[PDB]
Every structure is written in structure tokens, then in C-alpha cells.
Ligand binder design. Structure first.
Ligand SMILES: [Ca+2]
Ligand SMILES: [Cl-]
Ligand code: NA
Length: 223
């Protein structure tokens, strides 16, 4: 997250860190046994880290649970990042409390202008590199379809939306991938991609989660 603020310990209790020896991607807890992340985060040897603020310090609210199975979206295209969504089942149910809590799936798509909370442990620089160890937050509005398509000609599908600021300075960045965009208490986005970070006229592109609710619910019901 570039141009965000320090969330505060466990203030985003649905935020997970995907660990394969190190934080590599965000995720969103959606019930005691399932995480939603970006398909482009897929790899084996995933350990889901819940209750995290400092990812380098054991602070006392962590639950570390190995992934038992990953399900990349059937129609995920790694070249276009169309359908950049994946589900991870935990080997055991997370113990749910004030600091480790599921985020509600949307019943409806969010609209341009709606303010959302974007969070993750990604790069905090637009030029050069600095990884924070504590969770960073950004309040960003969803952008119009037409703005999003103008910003990225030929690249925005019906499964993508832009959130952020065309003036730049405030964005998601490398290491935020797979993390949440929460708009009035609902998971509407997954940190998917962008052109660099916090560049003018290159806002963050997010997986449109409302498109995937029937897939998520069916997958969970049979896995
Ligand atoms: Ca920690
Ligand atoms: Cl539009
Ligand atoms: Na379960």
C-alpha cells in the first residue's frame, strides 16, 4: 500500500497473510475454513496466517493454519488476469474472535463512488522499495467503468474494477495481491493488478467479487 496509513493491530480481522517461508500475498477470511485470494497468488506450500499485524513478530493473536486445498478459478487466465480469484481451504477451522473474523460476501456489486478499505503488507513506495511489517490501509473510492477502461485500454474485463485516485500517490502495490477491498462491510474486491503503483492515470485493478459469489458458495458447499 502506497500513501496509506498504519491500520492498527487486528483492526482488519478478515485480512490474512499467505506465507511460503515469507509473506507473499494477502487474502480475506470468508468463514472458519476458507480464504479468498488472487489466482496469481497460487503456489503450493501455503500457510495461512490470521490475526497478523507485524508479520515478523509473534504478537499473540496469530493463528497459523496450512492450506489443505487451493482452487484457482476454472476460467483464470494468467496472461490477462481475467478471473484472478482463488479459494484456499484451511487444514483446520480458524477459531473466530474479535481479531480473527470472516468478511461477508456481497449480495450486490458495489458502484463507482463507493468508499472502500484496501489493506496489505505490500510495498509502500511508488519508486523504489520498502516493505512495512505492520498492516497498511487505504480508503479508496471505486472508479467508473468508463474511467477504468480509459486508464487501461483493451485490458479491463467485466470481472475487474478500478479503485483509487487518477491523480496517483495512493494505491495498492507489490505484496498486496490477493488482499481485500471491503466496501460497507462486504468483500467487493481482490487486489489483482496495476501499472506500477500510485502512478497518475494508473489506479489499482481489482477482481470484481460480486461476479463470483455463486461460484464461491457452490465450491465451499462441495469441498
Ligand atoms: Ca505477527
Ligand atoms: Cl461507466
Ligand atoms: Na468447514
Amino acid at each position: 500500500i502506497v500513501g496509506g496509513y498504519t491500520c492498527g493491530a487486528n483492526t482488519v480481522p478478515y485480512q490474512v497473510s499467505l506465507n511460503s517461508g515469507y509473506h507473499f500475498c494477502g487474502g480475506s477470511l470468508i468463514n472458519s475454513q476458507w480464504v479468498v485470494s488472487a489466482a496469481h497468488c497460487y503456489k503450493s506450500g501455503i500457510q495461512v496466517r490470521l490475526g497478523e499485524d507485524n508479520i515478523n513478530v509473534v504478537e499473540g493473536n496469530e493463528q497459523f493454519i496450512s492450506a489443505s486445498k487451493s482452487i484457482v478459478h476454472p476460467s483464470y487466465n494468467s496472461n490477462t488476469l481475467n478471473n484472478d480469484i482463488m479459494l484456499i481451504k484451511l487444514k483446520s477451522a480458524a477459531s473466530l474472535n474479535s481479531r480473527v473474523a470472516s468478511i461477508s460476501l456481497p449480495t450486490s456489486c458495489a458502484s463507482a463512488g463507493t468508499q472502500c478499505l484496501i489493506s496489505g503488507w505490500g510495498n509502500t513506495k511508488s519508486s523504489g522499495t520498502s516493505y512495512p511489517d505492520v498492516l497498511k490501509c487505504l480508503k479508496a473510492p471505486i472508479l467508473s467503468d468508463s474511467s477504468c477502461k480509459s486508464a487501461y485500454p483493451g485490458q479491463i474485463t467485466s470481472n475487474m474494477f478500478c479503485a483509487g485516485y487518477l491523480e496517483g500517490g495512493k494505491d495498492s502495490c507489490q505484496g498486496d495481491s490477493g488482499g481485500p477491498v471491503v466496501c460497507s462491510g462486504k468483500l467487493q474486491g481482490i487486489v489483482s493488478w496495476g501499472s506500477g503503483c500510485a502512478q497518475k492515470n494508473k489506479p489499482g485493478v481489482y477482481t470484481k467479487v460480486c461476479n463470483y459469489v455463486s461460484w464461491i458458495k457452490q465450491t465451499i458447499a462441495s469441498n
